[PDB]
Amino acid sequence: SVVELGKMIIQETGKSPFPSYTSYGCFCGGGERGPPLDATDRCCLAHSCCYDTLPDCSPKTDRYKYKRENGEIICENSTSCKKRICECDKAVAVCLRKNLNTYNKKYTYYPNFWCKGDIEKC
């Protein structure tokens, strides 16, 4: 859920989802219209695409457990939805970290109605 996702994001990037990523570019916090503004925005695109393969779940409200062994995020659940959502969050947390050097503060609050390209799908 939002709790664990934020925990991962904070641990990987040093930034809090709000307000650093909740409205970033065209895809962070939600969005289907692109193109992505940069690598960070693409991480979010991938994250929503991930959540989209979880129709039987509630990604933002279903809690889950995870630990960190040898520095890596390890999703501890076997329970279907919990394990899947966790893998989706781990992926975005690490992606944002990998692309942290291009994070642009001018994109933090990018208007969503300024995103008028095609639907990226994934």
Coordinates of all heavy atoms in Angstrom, one line a residue, residues 53-120:
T53 N -1.7 -4.7 -14.1 CA -1.8 -6.1 -14.2 C -2.3 -6.7 -12.9 O -2.2 -7.9 -12.7 CB -0.4 -6.7 -14.6 OG1 0.5 -6.5 -13.5 CG2 0.1 -6.2 -15.9
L54 N -2.8 -5.8 -12.0 CA -3.3 -6.2 -10.7 C -4.7 -5.9 -10.5 O -5.1 -5.3 -9.5 CB -2.4 -5.5 -9.6 CG -1.1 -6.1 -9.1 CD1 -0.4 -6.9 -10.2 CD2 -0.3 -5.0 -8.5
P55 N -5.6 -6.3 -11.5 CA -7.0 -5.9 -11.4 C -7.8 -6.6 -10.2 O -8.8 -6.0 -9.8 CB -7.6 -6.4 -12.7 CG -6.8 -7.6 -13.0 CD -5.4 -7.3 -12.6
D56 N -7.3 -7.7 -9.7 CA -8.0 -8.4 -8.6 C -7.4 -7.9 -7.2 O -7.8 -8.4 -6.2 CB -7.7 -9.9 -8.7 CG -6.2 -10.2 -8.6 OD1 -5.5 -10.1 -9.7 OD2 -5.7 -10.6 -7.6
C57 N -6.6 -6.8 -7.3 CA -6.0 -6.3 -6.1 C -6.3 -4.8 -5.9 O -6.9 -4.1 -6.8 CB -4.5 -6.4 -6.1 SG -3.9 -8.1 -6.6
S58 N -5.9 -4.3 -4.7 CA -6.1 -2.8 -4.4 C -4.7 -2.3 -4.0 O -4.4 -2.2 -2.9 CB -7.0 -2.6 -3.3 OG -7.3 -1.3 -3.1
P59 N -3.8 -2.1 -5.0 CA -2.4 -1.7 -4.9 C -2.2 -0.6 -3.9 O -1.2 -0.6 -3.2 CB -2.1 -1.2 -6.3 CG -2.8 -2.2 -7.2 CD -4.2 -2.2 -6.5
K60 N -3.0 0.4 -3.8 CA -2.8 1.5 -2.9 C -3.3 1.3 -1.5 O -2.8 2.0 -0.6 CB -3.5 2.8 -3.4 CG -2.9 3.2 -4.8 CD -3.3 4.6 -5.2 CE -2.6 5.0 -6.5 NZ -2.8 6.5 -6.8
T61 N -4.1 0.3 -1.2 CA -4.6 0.0 0.1 C -4.2 -1.3 0.7 O -4.3 -1.5 1.9 CB -6.1 0.2 0.2 OG1 -6.7 -0.7 -0.8 CG2 -6.5 1.6 -0.1
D62 N -3.8 -2.3 -0.1 CA -3.4 -3.6 0.4 C -2.0 -3.5 1.0 O -1.0 -3.3 0.3 CB -3.4 -4.7 -0.7 CG -4.9 -5.0 -1.1 OD1 -5.7 -5.2 -0.2 OD2 -5.1 -5.2 -2.3
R63 N -1.9 -3.8 2.3 CA -0.6 -3.8 3.0 C 0.2 -5.0 2.6 O -0.4 -6.0 2.1 CB -0.8 -3.7 4.5 CG -1.6 -2.5 5.0 CD -0.8 -1.3 4.8 NE -1.7 -0.1 4.5 CZ -2.7 0.3 5.2 NH1 -3.0 -0.4 6.3 NH2 -3.4 1.3 4.9
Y64 N 1.5 -5.0 2.8 CA 2.4 -6.2 2.6 C 3.6 -6.1 3.4 O 4.0 -5.0 3.9 CB 2.7 -6.3 1.1 CG 3.4 -5.1 0.5 CD1 4.7 -5.0 0.6 CD2 2.6 -4.2 -0.3 CE1 5.4 -3.9 0.0 CE2 3.3 -3.1 -0.8 CZ 4.6 -2.9 -0.7 OH 5.3 -1.8 -1.3
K65 N 4.4 -7.2 3.5 CA 5.6 -7.1 4.3 C 6.8 -7.3 3.4 O 6.8 -8.0 2.4 CB 5.6 -8.3 5.3 CG 5.3 -9.7 4.7 CD 5.5 -10.7 5.7 CE 5.2 -12.1 5.2 NZ 5.3 -13.2 6.3
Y66 N 7.9 -6.6 3.8 CA 9.1 -6.7 3.1 C 10.3 -6.4 4.0 O 10.1 -5.8 5.1 CB 9.1 -5.8 1.9 CG 9.6 -4.4 2.1 CD1 10.9 -4.0 2.2 CD2 8.7 -3.3 2.3 CE1 11.4 -2.7 2.4 CE2 9.1 -2.0 2.4 CZ 10.4 -1.7 2.5 OH 10.8 -0.4 2.7
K67 N 11.5 -6.9 3.6 CA 12.7 -6.7 4.4 C 13.8 -6.3 3.5 O 13.6 -6.2 2.3 CB 13.1 -7.9 5.2 CG 13.3 -9.1 4.2 CD 13.9 -10.3 5.0 CE 14.2 -11.5 4.1 NZ 14.8 -12.6 4.9
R68 N 15.0 -6.0 4.0 CA 16.1 -5.6 3.2 C 17.3 -6.5 3.6 O 17.8 -6.3 4.7 CB 16.4 -4.2 3.4 CG 17.5 -3.6 2.4 CD 17.7 -2.2 2.7 NE 16.6 -1.3 2.3 CZ 16.4 -0.9 1.0 NH1 17.2 -1.3 0.1 NH2 15.3 -0.2 0.7
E69 N 17.7 -7.4 2.8 CA 18.8 -8.3 3.1 C 19.9 -8.0 2.1 O 19.7 -8.1 0.9 CB 18.4 -9.8 3.0 CG 17.9 -10.3 1.7 CD 17.5 -11.7 1.7 OE1 16.6 -12.1 2.5 OE2 18.1 -12.5 0.9
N70 N 21.1 -7.7 2.6 CA 22.3 -7.4 1.8 C 21.9 -6.3 0.9 O 22.3 -6.2 -0.3 CB 22.6 -8.7 0.9 CG 23.0 -9.9 1.8 OD1 22.1 -10.6 2.2 ND2 24.2 -10.1 2.1
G71 N 21.2 -5.3 1.4 CA 20.8 -4.1 0.7 C 19.6 -4.2 -0.3 O 19.1 -3.1 -0.6
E72 N 19.2 -5.4 -0.7 CA 18.1 -5.5 -1.6 C 16.8 -5.6 -1.0 O 16.6 -6.2 0.1 CB 18.4 -6.7 -2.5 CG 17.2 -7.0 -3.4 CD 17.5 -8.0 -4.5 OE1 18.2 -9.1 -4.2 OE2 17.2 -7.8 -5.7
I73 N 15.8 -5.1 -1.6 CA 14.4 -5.1 -1.2 C 13.9 -6.5 -1.4 O 13.9 -7.0 -2.5 CB 13.5 -4.2 -1.9 CG1 13.9 -2.7 -1.6 CG2 12.0 -4.4 -1.6 CD1 13.6 -2.4 -0.1
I74 N 13.5 -7.2 -0.3 CA 13.0 -8.6 -0.5 C 11.5 -8.6 0.0 O 11.2 -8.4 1.2 CB 13.8 -9.6 0.4 CG1 15.2 -9.5 -0.1 CG2 13.2 -11.0 0.2 CD1 15.5 -9.9 -1.5
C75 N 10.6 -8.9 -1.0 CA 9.2 -9.0 -0.7 C 9.0 -10.4 0.0 O 9.3 -11.4 -0.6 CB 8.4 -9.0 -2.0 SG 8.5 -7.3 -2.8
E76 N 8.5 -10.3 1.2 CA 8.3 -11.5 2.0 C 7.0 -12.3 1.8 O 6.9 -13.4 2.3 CB 8.4 -11.1 3.5 CG 9.8 -10.5 3.8 CD 9.8 -10.0 5.3 OE1 9.1 -9.1 5.6 OE2 10.6 -10.6 6.0
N77 N 6.0 -11.7 1.2 CA 4.7 -12.4 1.0 C 4.6 -13.5 0.0 O 5.3 -13.5 -1.0 CB 3.6 -11.4 0.7 CG 3.1 -10.7 1.9 OD1 2.5 -11.4 2.8 ND2 3.2 -9.4 2.0
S78 N 3.7 -14.5 0.2 CA 3.4 -15.5 -0.7 C 2.0 -15.2 -1.2 O 1.6 -15.5 -2.3 CB 3.4 -16.9 0.0 OG 2.3 -17.1 0.8
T79 N 1.2 -14.6 -0.3 CA -0.1 -14.2 -0.6 C -0.1 -13.4 -1.9 O 0.6 -12.4 -2.0 CB -0.7 -13.3 0.5 OG1 -0.6 -13.9 1.8 CG2 -2.2 -12.9 0.2
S80 N -0.8 -13.9 -2.9 CA -0.9 -13.3 -4.2 C -0.7 -11.8 -4.3 O 0.3 -11.3 -4.7 CB -2.1 -13.8 -4.9 OG -1.9 -13.7 -6.3
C81 N -1.8 -11.1 -4.1 CA -1.8 -9.6 -4.3 C -0.7 -8.9 -3.5 O 0.0 -8.0 -4.0 CB -3.2 -9.0 -3.8 SG -4.5 -9.2 -5.0
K82 N -0.5 -9.3 -2.2 CA 0.6 -8.7 -1.4 C 2.0 -8.8 -2.0 O 2.7 -7.8 -2.1 CB 0.5 -9.3 0.0 CG -0.6 -8.8 0.9 CD -0.6 -9.6 2.2 CE -1.4 -8.8 3.3 NZ -2.6 -8.2 2.8
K83 N 2.3 -10.0 -2.5 CA 3.6 -10.2 -3.1 C 3.7 -9.4 -4.5 O 4.8 -8.8 -4.7 CB 3.8 -11.7 -3.4 CG 5.1 -12.1 -4.1 CD 6.3 -11.7 -3.2 CE 7.6 -12.3 -3.8 NZ 7.9 -11.9 -5.2
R84 N 2.7 -9.5 -5.3 CA 2.7 -8.8 -6.6 C 2.9 -7.3 -6.4 O 3.7 -6.7 -7.1 CB 1.5 -9.1 -7.4 CG 1.4 -10.5 -7.9 CD 0.5 -10.5 -9.1 NE -0.9 -10.4 -8.8 CZ -1.5 -11.1 -7.8 NH1 -0.8 -11.9 -7.1 NH2 -2.8 -10.9 -7.6
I85 N 2.0 -6.6 -5.6 CA 2.1 -5.2 -5.4 C 3.5 -4.8 -4.9 O 4.1 -3.8 -5.3 CB 1.0 -4.8 -4.3 CG1 -0.4 -5.0 -4.9 CG2 1.2 -3.3 -4.0 CD1 -1.5 -4.8 -3.9
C86 N 4.0 -5.6 -4.0 CA 5.3 -5.3 -3.4 C 6.4 -5.4 -4.5 O 7.3 -4.5 -4.5 CB 5.7 -6.4 -2.4 SG 7.3 -6.2 -1.6
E87 N 6.3 -6.3 -5.5 CA 7.3 -6.4 -6.5 C 7.1 -5.2 -7.5 O 8.1 -4.7 -8.0 CB 7.1 -7.7 -7.4 CG 7.5 -9.0 -6.6 CD 9.0 -8.9 -6.3 OE1 9.8 -8.2 -7.0 OE2 9.4 -9.7 -5.3
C88 N 5.9 -4.7 -7.6 CA 5.7 -3.5 -8.4 C 6.3 -2.2 -7.8 O 6.8 -1.4 -8.5 CB 4.2 -3.2 -8.6 SG 3.3 -4.3 -9.8
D89 N 6.2 -2.2 -6.5 CA 6.8 -1.0 -5.7 C 8.3 -1.1 -5.7 O 8.9 0.0 -5.8 CB 6.2 -1.0 -4.3 CG 4.7 -0.7 -4.3 OD1 4.1 -0.3 -5.4 OD2 4.1 -0.8 -3.2
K90 N 8.8 -2.3 -5.5 CA 10.3 -2.4 -5.4 C 10.9 -1.9 -6.7 O 11.9 -1.3 -6.8 CB 10.6 -3.9 -5.2 CG 12.1 -4.2 -5.3 CD 12.4 -5.7 -5.2 CE 13.9 -6.0 -5.6 NZ 14.2 -7.4 -5.4
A91 N 10.2 -2.3 -7.8 CA 10.7 -1.9 -9.2 C 10.7 -0.4 -9.4 O 11.7 0.1 -9.9 CB 9.8 -2.6 -10.2
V92 N 9.6 0.3 -8.9 CA 9.6 1.7 -9.1 C 10.6 2.4 -8.1 O 11.2 3.4 -8.5 CB 8.2 2.3 -8.9 CG1 7.7 2.2 -7.5 CG2 8.2 3.7 -9.4
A93 N 10.7 1.9 -6.9 CA 11.6 2.5 -5.9 C 13.0 2.5 -6.5 O 13.7 3.5 -6.5 CB 11.6 1.8 -4.6
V94 N 13.5 1.3 -6.9 CA 14.8 1.2 -7.5 C 15.0 2.0 -8.8 O 16.1 2.5 -9.0 CB 15.2 -0.3 -7.7 CG1 16.5 -0.4 -8.5 CG2 15.2 -1.0 -6.4
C95 N 14.0 2.0 -9.6 CA 14.1 2.8 -10.9 C 14.3 4.2 -10.6 O 15.2 4.9 -11.2 CB 12.8 2.6 -11.7 SG 12.7 3.3 -13.3
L96 N 13.5 4.8 -9.7 CA 13.7 6.2 -9.3 C 15.1 6.5 -8.8 O 15.6 7.6 -9.1 CB 12.6 6.6 -8.3 CG 11.2 6.5 -8.8 CD1 10.2 6.8 -7.7 CD2 11.0 7.5 -9.9
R97 N 15.6 5.6 -8.1 CA 17.0 5.7 -7.5 C 18.0 5.8 -8.7 O 18.8 6.7 -8.8 CB 17.3 4.5 -6.6 CG 18.7 4.6 -6.0 CD 19.0 3.2 -5.4 NE 19.4 2.3 -6.5 CZ 19.3 1.0 -6.4 NH1 18.9 0.4 -5.2 NH2 19.6 0.2 -7.4
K98 N 17.9 4.8 -9.6 CA 18.8 4.7 -10.7 C 18.7 5.9 -11.6 O 19.7 6.3 -12.3 CB 18.4 3.5 -11.6 CG 18.8 2.2 -11.0 CD 20.4 2.1 -11.1 CE 20.8 0.7 -10.6 NZ 22.3 0.6 -10.6
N99 N 17.6 6.6 -11.7 CA 17.4 7.8 -12.5 C 17.4 9.1 -11.7 O 17.0 10.2 -12.2 CB 16.2 7.7 -13.3 CG 16.3 6.5 -14.3 OD1 16.9 6.6 -15.3 ND2 15.6 5.4 -14.0
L100 N 17.8 9.0 -10.4 CA 17.8 10.2 -9.5 C 18.6 11.4 -10.0 O 18.2 12.6 -9.8 CB 18.3 9.8 -8.2 CG 17.9 10.6 -6.9 CD1 16.4 10.9 -6.9 CD2 18.3 9.8 -5.7
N101 N 19.7 11.1 -10.8 CA 20.5 12.2 -11.2 C 19.9 13.1 -12.3 O 20.4 14.2 -12.6 CB 21.8 11.7 -11.8 CG 22.9 12.7 -12.0 OD1 23.3 13.4 -11.1 ND2 23.4 12.9 -13.2
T102 N 18.7 12.7 -12.8 CA 18.0 13.6 -13.8 C 16.7 14.1 -13.3 O 16.0 14.8 -14.0 CB 17.8 12.8 -15.2 OG1 17.1 11.6 -14.9 CG2 19.1 12.5 -15.8
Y103 N 16.4 13.9 -12.0 CA 15.2 14.4 -11.4 C 15.2 15.9 -11.6 O 16.2 16.5 -11.3 CB 15.2 14.1 -9.9 CG 13.9 14.6 -9.2 CD1 12.8 13.7 -9.0 CD2 13.9 15.9 -8.7 CE1 11.7 14.2 -8.3 CE2 12.7 16.3 -8.0 CZ 11.7 15.5 -7.8 OH 10.5 15.9 -7.2
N104 N 14.1 16.4 -12.2 CA 14.0 17.8 -12.5 C 12.9 18.5 -11.6 O 11.8 18.1 -11.7 CB 13.7 18.1 -13.9 CG 13.9 19.5 -14.3 OD1 13.7 20.4 -13.5 ND2 14.2 19.8 -15.6
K105 N 13.3 19.4 -10.8 CA 12.4 20.1 -9.9 C 11.3 20.9 -10.7 O 10.2 21.1 -10.2 CB 13.1 21.1 -8.9 CG 13.9 20.4 -7.9 CD 14.5 21.4 -6.9 CE 15.4 20.7 -5.9 NZ 14.7 19.7 -5.1
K106 N 11.6 21.2 -11.9 CA 10.6 21.9 -12.8 C 9.5 20.9 -13.2 O 8.5 21.4 -13.7 CB 11.3 22.5 -14.0 CG 11.9 23.9 -13.7 CD 10.7 24.9 -13.4 CE 11.3 26.3 -13.2 NZ 10.2 27.3 -12.8
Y107 N 9.7 19.6 -13.0 CA 8.7 18.7 -13.4 C 7.9 18.1 -12.2 O 6.9 17.4 -12.4 CB 9.3 17.4 -14.0 CG 10.0 17.7 -15.4 CD1 11.0 16.9 -15.9 CD2 9.5 18.8 -16.2 CE1 11.6 17.2 -17.1 CE2 10.1 19.0 -17.4 CZ 11.1 18.2 -17.9 OH 11.7 18.4 -19.1
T108 N 8.3 18.5 -11.0 CA 7.6 18.1 -9.8 C 6.1 18.3 -9.8 O 5.3 17.4 -9.4 CB 8.1 18.8 -8.5 OG1 9.6 18.6 -8.5 CG2 7.5 18.2 -7.3
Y109 N 5.7 19.5 -10.3 CA 4.2 19.8 -10.4 C 3.8 20.0 -11.8 O 2.9 20.9 -12.0 CB 4.0 21.1 -9.6 CG 4.4 20.9 -8.1 CD1 5.6 21.5 -7.7 CD2 3.6 20.3 -7.2 CE1 6.0 21.4 -6.3 CE2 4.0 20.2 -5.8 CZ 5.2 20.8 -5.4 OH 5.5 20.7 -4.1
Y110 N 4.3 19.3 -12.7 CA 3.9 19.4 -14.1 C 2.4 19.2 -14.3 O 1.9 18.2 -14.0 CB 4.7 18.4 -15.0 CG 4.6 18.7 -16.5 CD1 5.4 19.7 -17.1 CD2 3.8 17.9 -17.3 CE1 5.3 19.9 -18.4 CE2 3.7 18.2 -18.7 CZ 4.5 19.1 -19.2 OH 4.5 19.4 -20.6
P111 N 1.7 20.2 -14.9 CA 0.3 20.1 -15.2 C -0.1 18.9 -16.0 O 0.6 18.6 -17.1 CB -0.1 21.4 -15.9 CG 0.9 22.3 -15.4 CD 2.2 21.5 -15.4
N112 N -1.0 18.1 -15.6 CA -1.4 16.9 -16.3 C -2.1 17.2 -17.6 O -2.0 16.4 -18.6 CB -2.3 16.0 -15.5 CG -1.6 15.3 -14.3 OD1 -0.5 14.9 -14.4 ND2 -2.3 15.2 -13.2
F113 N -2.7 18.3 -17.7 CA -3.4 18.7 -19.0 C -2.4 19.2 -20.0 O -2.8 19.6 -21.1 CB -4.5 19.7 -18.7 CG -4.1 20.9 -17.9 CD1 -3.6 22.0 -18.4 CD2 -4.2 20.8 -16.5 CE1 -3.2 23.1 -17.6 CE2 -3.9 21.9 -15.7 CZ -3.3 23.0 -16.2
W114 N -1.1 19.2 -19.7 CA -0.1 19.6 -20.6 C 0.5 18.4 -21.2 O 1.5 18.4 -22.0 CB 1.0 20.3 -19.8 CG 0.8 21.8 -19.6 CD1 -0.4 22.4 -19.9 CD2 1.6 22.8 -19.1 NE1 -0.3 23.8 -19.6 CE2 1.0 24.0 -19.1 CE3 3.0 22.7 -18.6 CZ2 1.6 25.2 -18.6 CZ3 3.6 23.9 -18.2 CH2 2.9 25.1 -18.2
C115 N -0.1 17.2 -20.8 CA 0.4 15.9 -21.4 C -0.7 15.6 -22.5 O -1.8 15.2 -22.2 CB 0.4 14.9 -20.3 SG 1.4 15.4 -18.9
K116 N -0.3 15.8 -23.7 CA -1.2 15.6 -24.8 C -0.7 14.7 -25.9 O -1.2 14.8 -27.1 CB -1.6 17.0 -25.4 CG -2.4 17.8 -24.3 CD -2.6 19.3 -24.7 CE -1.4 20.1 -24.4 NZ -1.7 21.6 -24.6
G117 N 0.2 13.8 -25.6 CA 0.7 12.9 -26.6 C -0.2 11.6 -26.7 O -1.4 11.7 -26.4
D118 N 0.4 10.5 -27.0 CA -0.3 9.2 -27.2 C -0.4 8.5 -25.8 O 0.2 9.0 -24.8 CB 0.3 8.3 -28.1 CG 0.8 9.0 -29.4 OD1 0.0 9.7 -30.0 OD2 2.0 8.7 -29.8
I119 N -1.1 7.4 -25.7 CA -1.2 6.6 -24.5 C 0.0 5.7 -24.7 O 0.2 5.1 -25.7 CB -2.5 5.8 -24.4 CG1 -2.7 5.0 -25.7 CG2 -3.7 6.7 -24.2 CD1 -2.2 3.6 -25.7
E120 N 0.9 5.7 -23.6 CA 2.1 4.9 -23.7 C 1.8 3.4 -23.5 O 2.5 2.6 -24.0 CB 3.0 5.3 -22.6 CG 3.6 6.7 -22.7 CD 4.6 6.8 -23.9 OE1 5.5 6.0 -23.9 OE2 4.4 7.6 -24.8

